[PDB]
Amino acid sequence: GARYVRQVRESDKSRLVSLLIHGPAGSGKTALAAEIALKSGFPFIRLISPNELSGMSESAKIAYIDNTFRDAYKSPLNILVIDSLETLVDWVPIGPRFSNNILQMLKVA
Amino acid sequence: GIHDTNKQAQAENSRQRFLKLIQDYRIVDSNYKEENKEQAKRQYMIIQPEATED
Numbered sequence: 018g019a020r021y022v023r024q025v026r027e028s029d030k031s032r033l034v035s036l037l038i039h040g041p042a043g044s045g046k047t048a049l050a051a052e053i054a055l056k057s058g059f060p061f062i063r064l065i066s067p068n069e070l071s072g073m074s075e076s077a078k079i080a081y082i083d084n085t086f087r088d089a090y091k092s093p094l095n096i097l098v099i100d101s102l103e104t105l106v107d108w109v110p111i112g113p114r115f116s117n118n119i120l121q122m123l124k125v126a
Numbered sequence: 127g128i129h130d131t132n133k134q135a136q137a138e139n140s141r142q143r144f145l146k147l148i149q150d151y152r153i154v155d156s157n158y159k160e161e162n163k164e165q166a167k168r169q170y171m172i173i174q175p176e177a178t179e180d
């Protein structure tokens with residue numbers, strides 16, 4: 018993680034790097050993500066987590082997410098953490114059923 | 127049949143047979159309930175026809 022952080026810090030051509038952190042349930046992933054983010058020491062750090070979104074309507078969600086990407090385009094060094102993608106998009110295997118719009122917004126973002 | 131042993135015996139035989147019938151009915155019902163569950167599990171434990179109207 019530290020290597021990647023330095024790489025983004027220094028490079029002039031690589032202007033965007035994205036990572037996946039995957040593993041079994043209960044392995045303790047978000048802790049690692051947060052620790053990397055803190056120790057990185059950038060000016061600008063934000064978090065998107067399901068917890069903030071409970072009770073809102075769909076349009077509200079897409080608005081919020083759009084906002085949270087837009088506000089990060091100041092401050093020339095930035096870090097965002099997205100937590101638990103599958104639950105953000107409303108996955109349940111029986112149908113399967115889920116919300117396609119949110120999925121697209123994230124895909125394009 | 128309270129006052130005649132033979133009548134009482136007949137009554138008890140009928141009771142026994144009727145109890146056995148009740149047991150047969152119960153067994154059939156339970157077996158069928160257990161089988162209806164399996165078919166229900168079969169049908170929807172898989173990817174599904176394309177999504178509904180609205």
Ligand SMILES: Nc1ncnc2c1ncn2[C@@H]1O[C@H](COP(=O)(O)OP(=O)(O)OP(=O)(O)O)[C@@H](O)[C@H]1O
Nearest residue numbers: 040041042043044045046047048049050052100101
């Ligand atoms: N070596 C470790 N690295 C990270 N977290 C650890 C470690 N040892 C213990 N923990 C504990 O892990 C917890 C945080 O784990 P985390 O929130 O990532 O779980 P999770 O697997 O993402 O949860 P869920 O699967 O429900 O989403 C904290 O209680 C933290 O103290």
